[PDB]
Design a protein around this nucleic acid. Structure first.
Ligand SMILES: [K+]
Ligand SMILES: [K+]
Ligand SMILES: [K+]
Ligand SMILES: [K+]
Ligand SMILES: [K+]
Ligand SMILES: [K+]
Ligand SMILES: [K+]
Ligand SMILES: [K+]
Ligand SMILES: [K+]
Ligand SMILES: [Mg+2]
Ligand SMILES: [Mg+2]
Ligand SMILES: [Mg+2]
Ligand SMILES: [Mg+2]
Ligand SMILES: [Mg+2]
Ligand SMILES: [Mg+2]
Ligand SMILES: [Mg+2]
Ligand SMILES: [Mg+2]
Ligand SMILES: [Mg+2]
Ligand SMILES: [Mg+2]
Ligand SMILES: [Mg+2]
Ligand SMILES: [Mg+2]
Ligand SMILES: [Mg+2]
Ligand SMILES: [Mg+2]
Ligand SMILES: [Mg+2]
Ligand SMILES: [Mg+2]
Ligand SMILES: [Mg+2]
Ligand SMILES: [Mg+2]
Ligand SMILES: [Mg+2]
Ligand SMILES: [Mg+2]
Ligand SMILES: [Mg+2]
Ligand SMILES: [Mg+2]
Ligand SMILES: [Mg+2]
Ligand SMILES: [Mg+2]
Ligand SMILES: [Mg+2]
Ligand SMILES: [Mg+2]
Ligand SMILES: [Mg+2]
Ligand SMILES: [Mg+2]
Ligand SMILES: [Mg+2]
Ligand SMILES: [Mg+2]
Ligand SMILES: [Mg+2]
Ligand SMILES: [Mg+2]
Ligand SMILES: [Mg+2]
Ligand SMILES: [Mg+2]
Ligand SMILES: [Mg+2]
Ligand SMILES: [Mg+2]
Ligand SMILES: [Mg+2]
Ligand SMILES: [Mg+2]
Ligand SMILES: [Mg+2]
Ligand SMILES: [Mg+2]
Ligand SMILES: [Mg+2]
Ligand SMILES: [Mg+2]
Ligand SMILES: [Mg+2]
Ligand SMILES: [Mg+2]
Ligand SMILES: [Mg+2]
Ligand SMILES: [Mg+2]
Ligand SMILES: [Mg+2]
Ligand SMILES: [Mg+2]
Ligand SMILES: [Mg+2]
Ligand SMILES: [Mg+2]
Ligand SMILES: [Mg+2]
Ligand SMILES: [Zn+2]
Lengths: 252, 58, 102
RNA sequence: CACGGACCAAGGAGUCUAACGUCUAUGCGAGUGUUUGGGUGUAAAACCCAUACGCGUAAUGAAAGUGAACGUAGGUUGGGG
RNA sequence: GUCGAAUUUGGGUAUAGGGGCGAAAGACUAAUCGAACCAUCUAGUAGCUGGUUCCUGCCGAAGUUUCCCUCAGGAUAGCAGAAGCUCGUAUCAGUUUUAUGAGGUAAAGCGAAUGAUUAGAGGUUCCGGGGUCGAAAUGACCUUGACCUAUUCUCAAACUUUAAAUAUGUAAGAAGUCCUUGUUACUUAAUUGAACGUGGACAUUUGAAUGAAGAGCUUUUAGUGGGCCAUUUUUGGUAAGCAGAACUGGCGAUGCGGGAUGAACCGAACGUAGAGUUAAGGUGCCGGAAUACACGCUCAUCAGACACCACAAAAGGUGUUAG
RNA sequence: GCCCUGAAAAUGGAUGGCGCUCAAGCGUGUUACCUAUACUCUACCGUCAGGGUUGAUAUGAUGCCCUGACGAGUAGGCAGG
RNA sequence: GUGAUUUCUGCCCAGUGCUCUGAAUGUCAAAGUGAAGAAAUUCAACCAAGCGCGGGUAAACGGCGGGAGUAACUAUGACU
RNA sequence: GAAGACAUUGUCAGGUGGGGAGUUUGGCUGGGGCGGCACAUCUGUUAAACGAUAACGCAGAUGUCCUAAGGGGGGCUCAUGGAGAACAGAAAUCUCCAGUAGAACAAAAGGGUAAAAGCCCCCUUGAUUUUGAUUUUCAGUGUGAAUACAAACCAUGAAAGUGUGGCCUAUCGAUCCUUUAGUCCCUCGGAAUUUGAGGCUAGAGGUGCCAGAAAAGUUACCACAGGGAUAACUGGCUUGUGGCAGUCAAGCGUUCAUAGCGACAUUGCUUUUUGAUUCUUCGAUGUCGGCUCUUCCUAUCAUACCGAAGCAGAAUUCGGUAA
RNA sequence: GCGGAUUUAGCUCAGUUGGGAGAGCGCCAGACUGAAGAUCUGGAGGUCCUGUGUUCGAUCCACAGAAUUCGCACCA
RNA sequence: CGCGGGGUGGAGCAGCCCGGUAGCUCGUCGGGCUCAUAACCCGAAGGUCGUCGGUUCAAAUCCGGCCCCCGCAACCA
RNA sequence: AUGUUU
């Protein structure tokens, strides 16, 4: 009879992200004339830790092409990017790790990061530590690039969308056991109030669909329809299948 | 909780307080259930007897 | 039960007013019409919000219905209705009983 | 060996209203109701009043409708006076 | 318990009631939490609990019928009051008698039907047949069985020929009886009959007894719709101060005398007094009233001592008494 | 028949108590006696009923008076205060 | 959901769920269409999703047999 | 830049929707629940010889079945037994005799029935129409069922007659709505015609909780009004059960009924068993056991003194006065 | 104790409409095999769970009892 | 109540979508082959189309009822 | 294609 925890998360009162210590939004440069037609050279000034983020950020300073001043940008650092390195961003920049290129300008098999979904959105895909997008081909007519995303999905993107050459730094991070509730605590202290998690089966019926019973048990199928409503969508939402995954992925 | 089911106790006393009344016999009782053929002819016989007894006053 | 057709019985057609032959059929209710005032009122009452606004009977106990014979006079066409006692198997056809047979 | 009550004072519970049944009193009586309102006034009183309206004088039928004396407004039996 | 990090804590800040918040106890959300607090709707509804305020006088119940989503409630009828009304040569009655019915209980019956049921005796060998012979048949037997016949012992709420007692219907007159003859479309073969009449006759007992603060009639309303007890009939139960019926009388609703005491038993029902007599019960003393009279019985190292009723049995005793 | 055996329960206790033994016990019979709000008579109160009396000084005719009977009461009704 | 590590997580997709399929597919609303009628209206065809049909899924909910005989003493039954 | 008359948005429509809202989730009842139906009914009995009459009393039955198993008429006589006839015997079919019904009549039971109410045959639709009266249940309402007529039309029989369903006693259903039949009647209210709708009369679709709501659980988180009308303790009645004790004496005891036992029976006591009941307590009598402590009972284990023995002693057993 | 159930040749069972008791696995006999097992052919096999009762008969239309089980047996 | 679909030898079945005419496989019975079974071969048996009624020179097939099963949809006495 | 044992 009560509003459940996943429903309460949407109001965003105590469930907002803890963004005080963060360096700023990690974005490519605004897609401007210089990047649309040639390239622009910036310099990496700092590689810095971002709170709540696994991958380090790179503060890259470009010259303002229209006003005498510097424009600092917060990139997600690719592995191998170092301070004092010249980053080149644009249609005519070279195929070097850390450079920002349009997806059409890179050969098939190129590994890019912080890939734009649409040209100019300043980076949407393969931003987490160790992740990357693989160019698997181009369609020059109806100019598009087919790419492989970290999740294994194949996506067709505009050939004008940009990506950063290389793989997001900080990879292998999830290979270390946290080993400690305290370490999970400090991990989520800088991300959001989503931890620790009480099992719904350990609650009362008023609190959760799984609550109640003289033994802890779901009672009904945990696979919940996609057409279910808020307060019902606890468990395995719209599960195509359950049980231990046995066999191969990448269906056709 | 179960209760009493039935008794005629005190019923005769109640009925005899105002007494069992004989049903007030009348002369000329009603002809309600009487044979309608007999009644149909009785009406005509009575109308004729009334006319005759009226005319008999000369 | 087995009820025969052709029913020589009384007719009230104001022309026969006497025993005539009657074709026997079984009464079938007939489709509930819209525009019957009860149906109109019920639809108006069910419209909008409020849910079910009249009872819906559930506690069924009868296992039979009373068959009604429609007796139609073969000459004047006037119809009469006769109710039979409750029965589980009602046939209008023939196949009369035979005695002494196998 | 059921419940309330330690004690005392004061307060403390079938009321009023709309519409009605029976009975009774009163007025008038096939009629009755002046008081919506008007006139008037010694001014929320008392007094006076037209047209209406209500109920009654007719019932019955779903309705269209029809609508109450054979007679000394009947005969018989009882009936106070 | 823990005590250097999932640590403790101040202040600021955010989340607000079917909402929040929850390392999850339905926990916490200002002593309030399985839905906070405040005000209003709201004097919410209650078939449920409690209370319901002066006197006297007269009358005076019900716990039963039917129906209900009814079983702690209501409607309905009944019981009760009040108002009376029409009459009063008069009507009737928790009663008897006479006459005439009806009943299938008590009893009774089973050498009477049905059903139970004890035993012996005659037959049936076609007895059910076996055994045994019979070379074999039932042919002889023996025999067990059955049937049949005449008997015999015992039985029945759902057996019965018979059949009470109590209880119960009707009648015992003037709205009657008798005589004559008018109506009718009914009925008859038919003025045949049926019904209703006209006219005529019969008042001392007008057709048993007893009684009759009269009889009849109407309206309208209260409370009640938990009952319980005693004798007798009676069902279930080992039984019950159990549970359920019948008739009556009671208690409830009722004091009074008696049963010490006690709702119901006995007696008797009640204005205020006086006198007398009693009821039931008592009369050694408590305690009013004979330590009366008379014939017996009893001696108990647990005597006995008034019904309801407050307990005792089978079996025994040269105790004692009488047969 | 009476008495005894049969006959064992928990606080100390009950023919009501005391006590009673040719009883003050048991069975039976006869009288006398005691006493209820009952019965009988009388008085008074009230209720009901039936009557008398508007013939005057006479003011209580719902009055005055005569006669008989009756009187329990919860819930409840009505009446007079 | 389970609950360090270690070792291991067997069988079942019949049921209830969840999910994937889609004009070859039955049913299926309003609108729209056709017919009949003077019209209200009636009837018919068509009719999306859903369901049904076909598949997957248990580290989804869950579930995971009975009787008899039988071995150089009895007993027990590898066995049928 | 992307996208594009598609999204989106608005309205309606179908699906999905315990996420949420509102509500419901019978009654009787030897407490309630489970069980059952004693809830609407029928037979016999209880039931106490008019009628009425209760229990979760007893033995059963009903929600159907039948175009004949209804109606009329005719002819015949059933169960059973005996005696006979090739196959053919206990059972086939044929024949006679006896045969009060010991058969049959749809079903439960009871009643009823013999030229029939049974069996067979013939003809039929009275299982029809109209609207009244009446009986049972009863408030003298309804419903169901039934009775006797009236007014028609029919059936059957030679006819008298009989027939308004089943030989009788059970076999069933309001308002509103729908639907059908009938009357071709009334209304659609400014006036008409035709559709449509609404009326009047009679049925059908149903309420079995059967005088007739439309209805799933859980609460060990619980709440309120109450209830000793009602359970879980004591107490009270009872004592089946439990426990204890008698009487008789077939037997055991090598003999021998009773030293000690004791069958088949039978009489009791007790209330430290458990039931049965529901009288007290639900505005509350603190609900196991133990610990502690006092007292009481005796149906006595020991101790005292004794009687008996299948008591030689010893030990033991039975019993008495004894708590 | 309440509500269900099912009882049939040695074992598992089909039954049966008012007939008449059958099929497998067993068993016996006979085949085939050198022989055994396997396999084939046959045959017997019950007084139908019990008594009584309706019956022309009727385990079967039917009445009560048993046996073996299941489920329920709760609030204190 | 509506709309659809289906019922065929013992079993599953094709047959139907405009009569020329009831078949396929297994199972069952016999023979052959084999040293003996299986497969296989040759035979033989098994239905007149769930049940009625109707159209049609002659209907499993058309047409409408009835029964049974399934799927979806519907629900004021 | 199947054909156990001594
Ligand atoms: K957790
Ligand atoms: K749960
Ligand atoms: K509505
Ligand atoms: K499954
Ligand atoms: K599944
Ligand atoms: K929901
Ligand atoms: K609830
Ligand atoms: K006892
Ligand atoms: K209590
Ligand atoms: Mg986790
Ligand atoms: Mg918990
Ligand atoms: Mg929930
Ligand atoms: Mg759920
Ligand atoms: Mg738990
Ligand atoms: Mg009562
Ligand atoms: Mg709507
Ligand atoms: Mg007391
Ligand atoms: Mg109280
Ligand atoms: Mg107090
Ligand atoms: Mg005061
Ligand atoms: Mg909890
Ligand atoms: Mg108030
Ligand atoms: Mg009195
Ligand atoms: Mg009702
Ligand atoms: Mg009360
Ligand atoms: Mg009798
Ligand atoms: Mg007798
Ligand atoms: Mg009451
Ligand atoms: Mg009282
Ligand atoms: Mg008294
Ligand atoms: Mg006494
Ligand atoms: Mg003295
Ligand atoms: Mg004696
Ligand atoms: Mg004694
Ligand atoms: Mg004395
Ligand atoms: Mg004496
Ligand atoms: Mg006196
Ligand atoms: Mg007077
Ligand atoms: Mg008085
Ligand atoms: Mg573990
Ligand atoms: Mg449509
Ligand atoms: Mg679709
Ligand atoms: Mg809900
Ligand atoms: Mg109840
Ligand atoms: Mg009687
Ligand atoms: Mg005859
Ligand atoms: Mg009836
Ligand atoms: Mg007639
Ligand atoms: Mg009859
Ligand atoms: Mg009806
Ligand atoms: Mg209508
Ligand atoms: Mg108009
Ligand atoms: Mg009722
Ligand atoms: Mg009590
Ligand atoms: Mg005993
Ligand atoms: Mg009682
Ligand atoms: Mg206390
Ligand atoms: Mg105390
Ligand atoms: Mg002793
Ligand atoms: Mg060897
Ligand atoms: Zn006609």
């Amino acid at each position: 009879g009560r509003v459940i925890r996943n429903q309460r998360k949407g109001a965003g009162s105590i469930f907002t992200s803890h963004t005080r210590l963060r360096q700023g939004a990690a974005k490519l440069r605004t897609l401007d004339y210089a990047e649309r037609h040639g390239y622009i050279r910036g310099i990496v000034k700092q590689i810095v830790h971002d709170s709540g983020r696994g991958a380090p950020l790179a503060k890259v300073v470009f010259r303002d092409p229209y006003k005498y001043r510097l424009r600092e940008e917060i990139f997600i650092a690719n592995e191998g990017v170092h301070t004092g390195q010249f980053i080149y961003a644009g249609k005519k920049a070279s195929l070097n790790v850390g450079n920002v290129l349009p997806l059409g300008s890179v050969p098939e098999g190129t590994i890019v990061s912080n890939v734009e979904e649409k040209p100019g959105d300043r980076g949407a895909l393969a931003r987490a530590s160790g992740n990357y997008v693989i160019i698997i081909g181009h369609n020059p007519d109806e100019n598009k690039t087919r790419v492989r995303l970290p999740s294994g999905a194949k996506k067709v993107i505009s050939s004008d969308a940009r990506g950063v050459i290389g793989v997001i730094a900080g990879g292998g991070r999830v290979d270390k056991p946290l080993l400690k509730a305290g370490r999970a605590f400090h991990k989520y202290r800088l991300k959001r109030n989503s931890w620790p998690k009480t099992r719904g089966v350990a609650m009362n019926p008023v609190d959760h669909p799984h609550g109640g019973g003289n033994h802890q048990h779901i009672g009904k199928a945990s696979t919940i329809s996609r057409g279910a409503v808020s307060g019902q969508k606890a468990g395995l939402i719209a599960a195509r299948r359950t049980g231990l995954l046995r066999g191969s992925q990448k269906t056709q | 909780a179960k209760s009493k089911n039935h008794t005629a106790h005190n019923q005769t006393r109640k009925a005899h307080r105002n007494g069992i009344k004989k049903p007030k016999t009348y002369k000329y009782p009603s002809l309600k259930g009487v044979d309608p053929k007999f009644r149909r002819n009785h009406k005509h016989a009575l109308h004729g007897t009334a006319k005759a007894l009226a005319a008999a006053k000369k | 039960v087995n009820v025969p057709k052709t029913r020589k019985t009384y007719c009230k057609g104001k022309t026969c007013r006497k025993h005539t032959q009657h074709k026997v059929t079984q009464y079938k209710a007939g489709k509930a019409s819209l525009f019957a005032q009860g149906k109109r009122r019920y639809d108006r009452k069910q419209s909008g919000f409020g849910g079910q606004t009249k009872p819906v009977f559930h506690k069924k106990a009868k296992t039979t219905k009373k068959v009604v014979l429609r007796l139609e006079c073969v000459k004047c066409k006037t119809r009469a209705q006769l109710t039979l006692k409750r029965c589980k198997h009602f046939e209008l056809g023939g196949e009369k009983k035979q005695k002494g047979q196998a």
